[PDB]
Amino acid sequence: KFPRVKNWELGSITYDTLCAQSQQDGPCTPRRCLGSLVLPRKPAEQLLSQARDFINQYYSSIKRSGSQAHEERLQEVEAEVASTGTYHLRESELVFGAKQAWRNAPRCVGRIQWGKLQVFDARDCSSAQEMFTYICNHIKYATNRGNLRSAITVFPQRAPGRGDFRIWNSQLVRYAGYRQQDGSVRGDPANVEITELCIQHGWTPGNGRFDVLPLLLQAPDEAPELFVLPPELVLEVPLEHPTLEWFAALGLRWYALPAVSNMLLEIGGLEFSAAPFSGWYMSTEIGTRNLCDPHRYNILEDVAVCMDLDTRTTSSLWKDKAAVEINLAVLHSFQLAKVTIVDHHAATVSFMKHLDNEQKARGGCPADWAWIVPPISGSLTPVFHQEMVNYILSPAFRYQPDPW
Amino acid sequence: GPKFPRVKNWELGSITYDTLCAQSQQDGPCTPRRCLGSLVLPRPAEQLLSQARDFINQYYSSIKRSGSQAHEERLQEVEAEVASTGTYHLRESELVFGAKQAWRNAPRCVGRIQWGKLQVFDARDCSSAQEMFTYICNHIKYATNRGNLRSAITVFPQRAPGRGDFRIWNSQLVRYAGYRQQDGSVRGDPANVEITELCIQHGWTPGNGRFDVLPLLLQAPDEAPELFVLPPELVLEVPLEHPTLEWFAALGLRWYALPAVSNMLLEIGGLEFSAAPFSGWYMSTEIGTRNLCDPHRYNILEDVAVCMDLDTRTTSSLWKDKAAVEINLAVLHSFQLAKVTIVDHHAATVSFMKHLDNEQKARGGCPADWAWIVPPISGSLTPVFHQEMVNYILSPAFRYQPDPW
Numbered sequence: 001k002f003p004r005v006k007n008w009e010l011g012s013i014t015y016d017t018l019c020a021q022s023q024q025d026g027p028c029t030p031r032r033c034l035g036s037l038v039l040p041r042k043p044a045e046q047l048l049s050q051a052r053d054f055i056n057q058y059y060s061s062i063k064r065s066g067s068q069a070h071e072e073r074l075q076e077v078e079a080e081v082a083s084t085g086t087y088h089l090r091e092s093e094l095v096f097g098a099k100q101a102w103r104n105a106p107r108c109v110g111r112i113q114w115g116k117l118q119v120f121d122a123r124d125c126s127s128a129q130e131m132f133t134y135i136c137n138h139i140k141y142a143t144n145r146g147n148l149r150s151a152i153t154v155f156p157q158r159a160p161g162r163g164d165f166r167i168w169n170s171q172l173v174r175y176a177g178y179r180q181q182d183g184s185v186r187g188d189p190a191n192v193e194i195t196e197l198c199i200q201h202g203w204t205p206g207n208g209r210f211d212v213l214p215l216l217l218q219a220p221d222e223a224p225e226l227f228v229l230p231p232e233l234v235l236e237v238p239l240e241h242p243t244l245e246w247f248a249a250l251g252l253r254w255y256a257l258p259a260v261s262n263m264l265l266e267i268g269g270l271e272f273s274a275a276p277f278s279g280w281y282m283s284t285e286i287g288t289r290n291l292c293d294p295h296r297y298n299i300l301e302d303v304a305v306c307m308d309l310d311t312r313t314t315s316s317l318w319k320d321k322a323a324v325e326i327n328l329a330v331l332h333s334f335q336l337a338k339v340t341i342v343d344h345h346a347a348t349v350s351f352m353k354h355l356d357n358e359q360k361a362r363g364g365c366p367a368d369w370a371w372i373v374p375p376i377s378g379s380l381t382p383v384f385h386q387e388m389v390n391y392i393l394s395p396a397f398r399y400q401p402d403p404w
Numbered sequence: 405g406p407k408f409p410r411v412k413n414w415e416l417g418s419i420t421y422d423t424l425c426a427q428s429q430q431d432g433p434c435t436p437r438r439c440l441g442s443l444v445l446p447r448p449a450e451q452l453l454s455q456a457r458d459f460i461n462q463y464y465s466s467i468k469r470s471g472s473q474a475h476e477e478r479l480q481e482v483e484a485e486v487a488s489t490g491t492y493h494l495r496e497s498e499l500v501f502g503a504k505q506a507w508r509n510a511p512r513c514v515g516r517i518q519w520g521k522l523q524v525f526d527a528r529d530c531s532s533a534q535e536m537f538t539y540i541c542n543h544i545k546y547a548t549n550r551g552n553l554r555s556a557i558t559v560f561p562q563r564a565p566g567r568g569d570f571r572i573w574n575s576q577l578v579r580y581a582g583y584r585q586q587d588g589s590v591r592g593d594p595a596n597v598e599i600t601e602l603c604i605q606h607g608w609t610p611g612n613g614r615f616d617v618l619p620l621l622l623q624a625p626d627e628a629p630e631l632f633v634l635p636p637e638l639v640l641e642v643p644l645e646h647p648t649l650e651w652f653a654a655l656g657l658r659w660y661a662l663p664a665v666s667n668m669l670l671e672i673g674g675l676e677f678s679a680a681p682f683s684g685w686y687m688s689t690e691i692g693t694r695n696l697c698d699p700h701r702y703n704i705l706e707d708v709a710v711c712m713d714l715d716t717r718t719t720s721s722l723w724k725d726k727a728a729v730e731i732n733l734a735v736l737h738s739f740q741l742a743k744v745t746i747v748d749h750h751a752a753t754v755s756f757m758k759h760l761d762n763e764q765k766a767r768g769g770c771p772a773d774w775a776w777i778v779p780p781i782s783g784s785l786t787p788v789f790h791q792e793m794v795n796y797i798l799s800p801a802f803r804y805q806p807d808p809w
């Protein structure tokens with residue numbers, strides 16, 4: 001019923017009772033576990049019950065359950081859904097809802113920060129142009145000259161029988177990938193498709209390894225529009241290494257602001273199809289995944305050769321060695337640039353503290369072990385040895401289909 | 405698409421569907437409401453017969469004689485045995501098939517490319533602890549092969565109704581002692597504190613080193629376990645040195661050659677073999693990362709980092725990451741120099757991906773525990789990290805069982 005959760009480094013045991021609050025099924029069944037899969041395979045009373053649950057969450061949060069304001073708010077929601085098939089959140093409710101979705105996000109290692117989130121209400125946006133203004137302000141606010149601050153901008157909710165507000169980019173800041181005549185890629189192979197979409201919508205493309213993509217922004221039932229981010233808004237960090245003088249000569253660099261723009265924020269049964277959020281990077285996202293993944297910049301071999309490692313065989317651990325120096329270069333360069341970043345040891349340590357906080361606060365914490373455990377040096381971090389329970393709580397961030 | 409889990413590799417973009425999970429007749433710990441896939445240990449003639457029937461069907465399928473006269477006769481013979489005795493017995497080749505299939509079916513083992521090449525030792529005639537010792541020594545000699553390691557399993561008599569189990573009390577045939585100190589610390593391997601004390605309680609005169617090989621506590625049916633010291637010449641060990649860090653040798657670290665699990669229950673057609681030690685060869689990260697660097701194991705990370713003169717006062721120096729790499733390299737280098745079979749985490753995960761493709765074609769899927777398959781260092785540097793995996797319980801199976809004390 002309630003799962004026993006063991007930490008194998010410390011021998012300590014907890015029991016997750018929070019998971020009983022899950023109203024949504026994930027992909028596992030008793031016959032097989034699908035916990036390693038990245039993506040999911042796929043009226044009024046329903047909305048009304050998700051709404052009431054949410055409003056109840058909110059008033060309990062401000063310690064006013066049963067108050068007249070609480071009972072009144074419930075009747076407003078009920079009156080509105082009964083008449084219109086939908087309802088609208090008050091700004092304070094949206095702010096609470098956004099924080100809870102972040103708190104409930106099982107794949108986020110940064111949730112120790114969940115209570116500190118600047119929420120921009122952009123629900124009065126009626127055009128792609130206005131979306132762009134809102135986005136620019138978000139980036140300006142969040143970047144803060146390198147003293148990064150977590151933020152989310154919330155655009156208008158989905159509505160029955162009209163197109164969604166959507167940001168076509170998967171991140172607000174990302175580098176282009178240009179498919180070359182011989183079928184290689186200059187730039188970021190993860191972004192070949194969005195790059196091609198930008199060009200087809202009139203963007204004049206650069207030809208570098210790190211060309212910042214323009215935004216494709218879509219207002220309901222309209223073709224998406226192209227907007228070039230002003231370069232002065234996009235803070236970037238040149239990569240150099242503390243001891244390897246040759247490393248800077250690789251011409252490598254990365255952007256400061258990690259901002260997801262393709263996810264759906266669901267609150268009280270309402271869905272926000274455009275609600276970009278940003279925090280700050282954990283170094284391995286850049287050093288290990290972005291730069292070392294075989295299907296990303298894939299620079300492992302190049303670095304190892306610069307290090308004169310023996311690439312002929314796997315047992316020299318040339319890959320492990322290069323990867324460490326790359327992550328070290330990312331930490332060093334961000335610190336030298338005074339741009340907020342957290343290494344995977346510090347991050348995982350703070351996540352453990354978060355598990356403890358949430359255990360006392362809520363009786364558990366949904367966590368996806370495969371995502372929380374860093375992509376290098378797994379068992380060198382405390383989260384490796386910590387069992388975790390995964391489940392879906394609402395409010396939630398969800399994946400949604402690419403709008404094209 | 406099909407009504408089966410869609411499985412994606414995100415590096416290559418390739419898609420398979422697992423149809424093999426349909427053959428699973430045993431529930432795991434997950435439900436639609438929550439995934440417990442990360443938990444290490446999650447919680448009658450009628451039942452025996454259906455399990456037995458199922459395995460006999462598996463056996464005859466594998467020899468391509470499903471539905472044959474010998475198939476139906478074997479089914480009848482098993483039902484009649486269970487009818488008169490309450491249990492039944494495997495033919496020798498059925499045992500070999502079952503032990504191989506249990507290995508093939510093990511979601512947590514990355515070494516499964518080798519599954520067809522397992523030497524199965526039949527020790528179902530064993531009738532004493534002394535005899536178990538002989539069989540185990542023989543296993544260790546055969547499997548070690550002076551450094552050219554060979555996969556093997558030795559199978560002792562099955563669990564019998566109204567008779568005590570054959571049990572090996574040790575969790576591995578070879579493991580190091582852990583001596584609790586008066587200051588509260590542990591000398592040796594902290595993993596082994598309890599078994600070390602049980603050995604002493606049973607009359608073992610304890611050492612006082614960091615790497616004292618443990619004696620075996622062996623239990624024949626309905627008898628107190630008996631203590632047996634392994635003759636040092638049978639236990640191959642490898643002193644650790646580093647290819648370029650000349651001081652690493654001075655740390656006096658070492659590890660044993662033979663990784664032999666000895667406390668898992670082997671289950672085949674409902675028959676339960678409570679003592680069936682098996683052994684392969686190490687993947688280097690088992691020694692280098694887990695045994696030597698786990699905080700609750702030898703915990704040598706800080707020590708090595710200090711010798712490397714790293715900044716252990718801040719996480720951002722990546723001192724743990726650097727030291728861990730050199731320790732893993734020392735493990736590989738030393739085993740290679742000593743000519744003792746070992747496989748690094750890159751070569752092992754590449755072979756497992758090949759194994760996945762083999763099993764996709766052969767069986768339509770492969771049960772795999774992602775958390776265990778992905779190595780504890782350099783995770784996304786290996787191809788298995790980017791491979792989605794479906795986990796389920798197939799039988800024959802290796803299973804955990806409670807410590808006999």
Ligand code: HEM
Nearest residue numbers: 102105107108109110113150151277278279280281282397
């Ligand atoms: C403040 C510092 C933050 C850190 C250090 C952090 C860290 C991370 C990391 C390492 C991941 C794994 C992503 C990947 O590897 O693809 C992740 C995912 C995620 N984070 Fe955060 N995060 C932060 C802020 C935020 C904020 C402000 C939100 C929402 C308001 C958020 C919500 C999420 C969600 C929903 C995911 C899952 C993304 C996906 O599945 O693609 N995080 N986070």
Ligand code: HEM
Nearest residue numbers: 507510512513514515518555556682683684685686687802
């Ligand atoms: C031949 C070379 C082999 C390699 C490289 C290999 C590799 C591995 C590794 C790295 C693990 C993870 C164990 C841990 O991290 O605690 C494992 C687990 C396991 N292996 Fe193997 N293995 C090999 C041979 C075998 C054989 C011969 C068998 C049985 C006939 C076997 C059955 C198992 C089982 C049942 C587990 C799960 C153990 C547990 O959950 O504690 N393996 N293997």
Ligand SMILES: N#Cc1cccc(CNCCc2ccnc(-n3ccnc3)n2)c1
Nearest residue numbers: 038108171258259260277278279280399
């Ligand atoms: N769909 C999809 C899909 C599948 C796997 C990974 C993905 C990207 N994951 C998020 C990557 C990312 C990038 C920048 N920033 C952040 N980020 C910011 C705060 N927390 C995470 N996360 C999407």
Ligand SMILES: N#Cc1cccc(CNCCc2ccnc(-n3ccnc3)n2)c1
Nearest residue numbers: 444513576663664665682683684685804
């Ligand atoms: N019960 C239990 C339990 C929980 C976590 C880890 C554990 C040990 N896992 C096996 C370790 C191990 C040691 C030597 N050899 C092998 N081995 C040999 C062939 N394949 C794996 N495996 C047991």
Ligand SMILES: C[C@H](O)[C@H](O)[C@H]1CNc2nc(N)[nH]c(=O)c2N1
Nearest residue numbers: 036037038370371789790791792
């Ligand atoms: C197949 C596997 O689930 C996939 O590669 C996951 C593994 N863990 C991850 N962990 C993080 N933090 N980010 C990721 O994209 C992934 N990808």
Ligand SMILES: C[C@H](O)[C@H](O)[C@H]1CNc2nc(N)[nH]c(=O)c2N1
Nearest residue numbers: 384385386387442443444775776
């Ligand atoms: C808590 C977590 O499940 C536990 O530490 C697991 C993770 N993955 C593992 N993987 C392997 N190969 N061996 C292990 O012992 C573990 N331990």
Ligand SMILES: OC[C@@H](O)[C@@H](O)[C@H](O)[C@H](O)CO
Nearest residue numbers: 170190191192193194262402
């Ligand atoms: O080129 C488009 C891709 O970046 C995009 O499809 C992402 O894979 C997707 O949005 C999930 O991140």
Ligand SMILES: OC[C@@H](O)[C@@H](O)[C@H](O)[C@H](O)CO
Nearest residue numbers: 575595596597598599600667
């Ligand atoms: O010292 C006792 C332990 O080694 C023992 O309890 C093991 O943890 C157990 O047998 C499973 O590995």
Ligand SMILES: [Zn+2]
Nearest residue numbers: 028033434439
């Ligand atoms: Zn699961």
